[PDB]
Amino acid sequence: GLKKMAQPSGCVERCVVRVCYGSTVLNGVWLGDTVTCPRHVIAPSTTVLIDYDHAYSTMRLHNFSVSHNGVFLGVVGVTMHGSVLRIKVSQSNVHTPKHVFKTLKPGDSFNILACYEGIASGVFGVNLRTNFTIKGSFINGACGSPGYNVRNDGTVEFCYLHQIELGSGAHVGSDFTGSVYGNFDDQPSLQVESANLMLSDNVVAFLYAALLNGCRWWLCSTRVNVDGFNEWAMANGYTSVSSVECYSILAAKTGVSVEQLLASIQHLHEGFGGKNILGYSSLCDEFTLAEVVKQMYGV
Amino acid sequence: GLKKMAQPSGCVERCVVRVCYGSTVLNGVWLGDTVTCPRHVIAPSTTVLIDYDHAYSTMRLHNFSVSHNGVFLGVVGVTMHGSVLRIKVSQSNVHTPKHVFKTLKPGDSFNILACYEGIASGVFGVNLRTNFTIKGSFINGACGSPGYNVRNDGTVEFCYLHQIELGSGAHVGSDFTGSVYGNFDDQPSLQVESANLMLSDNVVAFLYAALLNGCRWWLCSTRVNVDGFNEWAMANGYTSVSSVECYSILAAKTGVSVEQLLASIQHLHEGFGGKNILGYSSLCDEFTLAEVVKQMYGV
Numbered sequence: 001g002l003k004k005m006a007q008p009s010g011c012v013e014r015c016v017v018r019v020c021y022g023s024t025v026l027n028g029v030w031l032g033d034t035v036t037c038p039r040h041v042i043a044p045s046t047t048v049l050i051d052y053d054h055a056y057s058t059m060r061l062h063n064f065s066v067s068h069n070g071v072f073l074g075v076v077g078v079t080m081h082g083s084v085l086r087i088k089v090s091q092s093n094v095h096t097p098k099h100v101f102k103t104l105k106p107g108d109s110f111n112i113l114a115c116y117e118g119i120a121s122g123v124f125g126v127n128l129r130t131n132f133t134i135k136g137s138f139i140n141g142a143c144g145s146p147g148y149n150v151r152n153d154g155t156v157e158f159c160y161l162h163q164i165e166l167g168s169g170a171h172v173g174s175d176f177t178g179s180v181y182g183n184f185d186d187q188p189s190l191q192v193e194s195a196n197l198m199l200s201d202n203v204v205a206f207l208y209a210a211l212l213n214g215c216r217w218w219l220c221s222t223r224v225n226v227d228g229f230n231e232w233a234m235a236n237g238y239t240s241v242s243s244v245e246c247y248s249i250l251a252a253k254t255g256v257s258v259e260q261l262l263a264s265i266q267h268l269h270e271g272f273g274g275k276n277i278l279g280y281s282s283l284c285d286e287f288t289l290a291e292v293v294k295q296m297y298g299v
Numbered sequence: 300g301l302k303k304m305a306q307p308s309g310c311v312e313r314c315v316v317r318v319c320y321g322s323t324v325l326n327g328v329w330l331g332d333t334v335t336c337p338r339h340v341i342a343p344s345t346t347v348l349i350d351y352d353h354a355y356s357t358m359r360l361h362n363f364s365v366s367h368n369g370v371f372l373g374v375v376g377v378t379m380h381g382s383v384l385r386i387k388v389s390q391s392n393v394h395t396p397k398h399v400f401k402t403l404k405p406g407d408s409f410n411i412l413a414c415y416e417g418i419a420s421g422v423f424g425v426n427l428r429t430n431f432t433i434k435g436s437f438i439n440g441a442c443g444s445p446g447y448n449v450r451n452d453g454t455v456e457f458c459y460l461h462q463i464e465l466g467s468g469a470h471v472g473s474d475f476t477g478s479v480y481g482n483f484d485d486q487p488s489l490q491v492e493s494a495n496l497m498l499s500d501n502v503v504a505f506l507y508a509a510l511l512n513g514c515r516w517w518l519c520s521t522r523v524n525v526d527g528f529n530e531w532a533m534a535n536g537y538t539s540v541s542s543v544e545c546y547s548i549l550a551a552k553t554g555v556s557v558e559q560l561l562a563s564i565q566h567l568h569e570g571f572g573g574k575n576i577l578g579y580s581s582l583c584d585e586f587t588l589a590e591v592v593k594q595m596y597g598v
């Protein structure tokens with residue numbers, strides 16, 4: 001049974017604050033005596049291109065309002081770093097979890113805490129796609145919503161701050177250093193993301209899960225090695241496949257090698273027509289190897 | 300766009316405890332000075348039908364261990380209520396949320412906090428199906444994982460305690476009064492659940508959601524009334540559609556009555572023609588009316 005899940009959100013909920021500047025409202029993340037939020041909060045109300053360097057120089061501390069569960073925090077100073085602000089506040093978050101900052105790469109899964117006016121309203125897992133966007137569920141007010149993973153020892157990795165929705169509906173964020181993923185611009189524009197590629201590492205994990213669930217009508221006995229598959233992948237909307245030995249736990253059971261699965265992918269690439277795999281009508285790239293192993297065996 | 304989300308889990312994480320009896324270990328829920336957990340924890344280790352009234356009679360309080368974050372609570376007394384135990388402990392949970400207990404009905408959505416040895420590991424939303432099972436992701440140790448909903452006022456409704464995985468992989472739980480949903484037996488046996496029906500109320504919500512995204516190739520211009528659809532639903536594995544009242548918010552913004560959607564369901568009943576609606580190739584009964592409204596409008 002494969003169910004997309006989120007890791008528990010309680011320790012991140014204690015770090016979400018409401019950040020207001022003039023009339024603009026979004027979410028920030030409060031760690032120690034620092035609040036990080038998108039710099040969109042200081043943007044003037046206008047249609048034209050925003051000049052964030054100008055807005056930053058004309059910024060006044062007293063125009064800020066930062067609160068946690070209605071309790072307001074004093075603003076001491078502010079600095080700009082790419083597309084985020086670092087707001088120093090007059091008290092430390094005593095519920096700051098043990099944490100680090102990590103930048104995500106395409107193929108990485110993580111957790112989104114969807115927040116409105118500094119209040120979490122939902123949590124879900126997502127994958128950073130090859131075009132550096134995610135498929136979230138956001139409405140007006142979710143700017144600054146955090147993305148995170150919890151490591152095995154309980155260290156939270158903060159990796160994402162929601163910034164903007166593109167015209168196609170794809171969602172874009174930044175890391176906590178202020179780099180926008182995919183280097184989109186953090187203001188409204190006509191930018192379009194590149195084509196989505198199917199994450200081959202996730203498709204392999206998916207097919208190993210199908211095998212462990214007695215679903216093997218689709219198995220090919222042909223073998224395609226990694227170099228060959230990677231060459232085919234370029235021609236057909238798939239990423240290269242990373243490695244084989246990560247899957248050797250899965251190849252010892254099932255008895256099927258990664259190269260048989262790679263051959264299977266090339267065979268199923270058209271579609272399953274008249275059949276499904278684990279209830280899916282086409283190849284699923286939603287789940288990582290880590291997810292499959294964790295949800296199946298608790299590792 | 301429609302994504303299955305959970306409500307944040309922080310307030311429920313602080314209620315989850317590790318209940319041990321002899322060598323048997325599972326999860327419990329600590330509210331005030333009561334821990335509620337499945338009665339399987341006092342089952343003897345055996346491959347025969349378990350007589351729970353006898354196990355309850357031979358029970359000894361000193362055999363229990365109840366802990367939170369490796370901190371042990373004193374057990375004061377235990378009573379049995381259907382498939383659950385209520386363990387009184389000598390400490391009250393100081394983080395007990397404002398809460399009620401609620402029994403789910405088929406078609407209700409809720410949140411699962413999946414737990415192992417008293418520690419939350421994942422959170423996901425699910426839907427109670429017509430055969431009173433859910434499709435979750437649980438492995439050994441998950442029993443006693445709680446399901447919940449959070450109301451507008453912040454009241455947590457506790458509605459589910461995970462009990463058992465069936466032969467088909469479907470999951471069975473009880474409410475906090477001890478009744479097993481669907482009256483399955485809370486122990487190993489060969490029980491098979493009756494087949495599932497399509498929740499028409501949810502399918503209608505999902506088609507309104509598609510209309511709000513411009514996906515409307517599927518729209519029938521014709522109409523069927525409620526009585527005709529329900530007669531059709533009986534003979535095709537669909538639930539009866541409720542009323543047309545609830546969909547006022549959606550019928551108003553779409554200008555599409557429920558009767559047109561019921562007609563569209565009959566047409567789309569078999570086959571989308573290879574085509575697609577919001578990422579699905581067949582109709583979807585996983586989203587309720589309330590979920591669609593909250594995700595499109597925040598209400």
Ligand SMILES: CC(C)=CC[C@@H](O)C1=CC(=O)c2c(O)ccc(O)c2C1=O
Nearest residue numbers: 337339344345346442462463485486487
């Ligand atoms: C004792 C016998 C040899 C097998 C028991 C196993 O099947 C089982 C494990 C379990 O952990 C559990 C619960 O936690 C809750 C209800 C429930 O029936 C169960 C179970 O039947």
